[PDB]
């Protein structure tokens, strides 16, 4: 039964109703308010960068994975 349910939940994970319940957690108030603020910052930063690419000829695209790296000693 428990193994059956585990496979069952995985199959219907992309569902709306199953998502709403499955991702729902009660975080402390301080951790939340960080997230709403952290979300509003992230949305705007995208919007400014999106507005840049309209008029900037040479803005490369940098993947999120390659963002944190400043450099490596032995290049390859």
């Amino acid at each position: 039964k428990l193994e059956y349910d585990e496979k069952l939940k995985e199959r219907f994970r992309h569902m709306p109703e199953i998502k709403r319940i499955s991702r729902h957690r009660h975080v402390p108030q301080v951790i939340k308010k960080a997230q709403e603020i952290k979300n509003i910052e992230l949305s705007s930063i995208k919007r400014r960068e999106a507005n840049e690419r309209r008029t900037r000829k040479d803005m490369p695209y940098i993947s999120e994975r390659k963002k944190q790296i400043v450099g490596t000693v032995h290049k390859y």
Partner: protein, 237 residues
Amino acid sequence: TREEFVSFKAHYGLVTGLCVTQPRFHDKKPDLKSQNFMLSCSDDKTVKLWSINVDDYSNKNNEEGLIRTFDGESAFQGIDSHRENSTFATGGAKIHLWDVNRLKPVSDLSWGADNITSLKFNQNETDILASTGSDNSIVLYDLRTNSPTQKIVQTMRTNAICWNPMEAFNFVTANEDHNAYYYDMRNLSRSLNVFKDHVSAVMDVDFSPTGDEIVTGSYDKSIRIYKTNHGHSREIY
């Protein structure tokens, strides 16, 4: 049982590192069945190796307490023990290699004058060591070569490193930019994966012995669990 085998006032200062080891003294085989040893380093510039009595087996029927002490010229900040053998490496102002049967550091490893904040041995390719700096850097070492190998500088400091038990060549880094980064040892230019849920600095990270999950402790008063193949936590504690 949620009780203490023993309690020691090990150091005058703060305990800045700790690891549990199975020493291999050259002329003596420790009774690991009846004793377990733990190794602690502190900012009092000392490393003290301990012995504890345990009741795991009843094939016998003491000497519990401090066993040996290594003196250091500088403050220590991180310690970890080679799995296959007894040798262990301590990280302070310089990252040192020690041997349980030698009071002075057996060999010196160091990229440069920058100090080392934390370190962690590999769990499968036991000869490879990773370390973290105060210059926002990650170094990689190879004991078979007895030298550093690669250095990478990040936008912010990294506090802990853990090696994937199932994939010898992977490690995750707890970072101070609210993130944990999953790296490939052979190509550090690009990170395999990035975990982004946390809202304060991440302080430690660990791999499930199954290799399929990582937990990250944060300064935000929370514990998060991630899957190795997805970029967000499946739980918050």
